[PDB]
Amino acid sequence: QAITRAMADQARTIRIPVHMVEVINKLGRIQRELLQDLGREPTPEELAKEMDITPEKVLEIQQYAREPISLDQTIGDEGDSQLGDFIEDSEAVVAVDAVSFTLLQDQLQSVLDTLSEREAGVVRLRFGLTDGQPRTLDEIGQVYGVTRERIRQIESKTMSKLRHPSRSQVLRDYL
């Protein structure tokens, strides 16, 4: 019992609960016992029939039991490099989309400044540009001394003027 429990929750780099390492072990044993009796690899639907459970769960457990690999094992037939040299860092900044984002921000500032200042501020705090949080209408009213219906109307004015092709063409290109 102690050995099995320890091998269950301690022998894996990605720890797996015993309750379902049990079913991985049982799936493996039944598939390799049926393989020799039938002569072929057991299709997961037949394995599910032996499971009394849905096959999709069988594929899920099959892909769960797969263990991680090492980043530093030599990958070539000849020993010259490791696996980790060929993995791209996804989290790294593209260094191209950053400049694009900055220029898009500049274009947005120019477009908003072209619009009337009240509308620009309304939309800026509506979508939370200058700050971290977009705000609801009542905040806009409390900061501009107007009712929320008036803010809805000025927002209607904003996207109405923003559909103007002068801004529409100059901004739609940025995609």
Partner 1 sequence: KRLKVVAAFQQSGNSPMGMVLDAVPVIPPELRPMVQLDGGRFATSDLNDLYRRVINRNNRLKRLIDLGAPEIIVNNEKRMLQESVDALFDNGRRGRPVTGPGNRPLKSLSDLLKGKQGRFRQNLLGKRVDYSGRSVIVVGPQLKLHQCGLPKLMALELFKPFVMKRLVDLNHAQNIKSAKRMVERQRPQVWDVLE
Partner 2 sequence: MLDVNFFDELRIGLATAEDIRQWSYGEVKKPETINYRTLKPEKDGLFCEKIFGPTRDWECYCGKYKRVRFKGIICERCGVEVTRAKVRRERMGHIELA
Partner 3 sequence: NSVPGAPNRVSFAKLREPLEVPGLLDVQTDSFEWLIGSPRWRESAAERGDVNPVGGLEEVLYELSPIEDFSGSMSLSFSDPRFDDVKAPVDECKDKDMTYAAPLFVTAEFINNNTGEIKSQTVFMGDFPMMTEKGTFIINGTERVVVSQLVRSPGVYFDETIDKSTDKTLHSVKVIPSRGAWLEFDVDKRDTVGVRIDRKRRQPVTVLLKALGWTSEQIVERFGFSEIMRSTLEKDNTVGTDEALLDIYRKLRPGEPPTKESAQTLLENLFFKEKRYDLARVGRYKVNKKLGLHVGEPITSSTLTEEDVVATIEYLVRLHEGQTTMTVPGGVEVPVETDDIDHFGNRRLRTVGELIQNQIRVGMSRMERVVRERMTTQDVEAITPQTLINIRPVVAAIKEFFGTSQLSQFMDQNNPLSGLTHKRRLSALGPGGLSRERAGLEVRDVHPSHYGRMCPIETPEGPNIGLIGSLSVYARVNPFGFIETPYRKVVDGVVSDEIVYLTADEEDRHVVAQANSPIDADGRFVEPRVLVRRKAGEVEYVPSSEVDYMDVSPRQMVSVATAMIPFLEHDDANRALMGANMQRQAVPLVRSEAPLVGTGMELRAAIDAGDVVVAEESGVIEEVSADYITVMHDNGTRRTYRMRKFARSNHGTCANQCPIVDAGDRVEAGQVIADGPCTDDGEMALGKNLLVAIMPWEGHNYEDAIILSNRLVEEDVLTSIHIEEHEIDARDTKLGAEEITRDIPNISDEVLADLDERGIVRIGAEVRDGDILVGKVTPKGETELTPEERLLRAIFGEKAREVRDTSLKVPHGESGKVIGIRVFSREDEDELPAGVNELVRVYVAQKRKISDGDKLAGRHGNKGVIGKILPVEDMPFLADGTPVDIILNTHGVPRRMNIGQILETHLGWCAHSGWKVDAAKGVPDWAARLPDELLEAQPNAIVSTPVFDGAQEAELQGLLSCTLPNRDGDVLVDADGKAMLFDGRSGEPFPYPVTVGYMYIMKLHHLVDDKIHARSTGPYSMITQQPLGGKAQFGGQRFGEMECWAMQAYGAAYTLQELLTIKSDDTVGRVKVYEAIVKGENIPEPGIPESFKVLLKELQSLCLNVEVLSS
Contact residues: partner 3, CB under 8 A: 32, 36-37, 39, 44, 59, 62-63, 77-78, 84-89, 92-96, 98-99, 101-102, 104-105, 108, 123, 127-129, 134, 159, 162-163, 167-168, 171-172, 174-175
Q: Does 17 bind partner 1 (CB under 8 A)?
A: no
CB of 91 to partner 2, least distance (A): 7
Question: Can you tell me the distance from the alpha carbon of 148 to that of 79, in angstroms, rounded to the nearest whole number?
Answer: 70
Q: Which residues bind partner 2 (CB under 8 A)?
A: 10, 13-17, 64, 91, 131-133
Question: Can you tell me the distance from the alpha carbon of 101 to that of 93, in angstroms, rounded to the nearest whole number?
Answer: 12
CB of 104 to partner 2, least distance (A): 18
Query: What is the dihedral sign for C-alpha 154, 160, 162, 167?
Result: negative
Residue 107 class from Cβ within 10 Å (0-12 exposed, 13-18 middle, 19+ buried)? middle
Which phi and psi (to 5°) does residue 105 adopt? Answer: -60, -40
Query: Which residues contact partner 1 by CB under 8 A?
Result: 10, 13-14, 63, 66-73, 83-84, 87, 96, 99-100, 103, 107, 170, 173-175
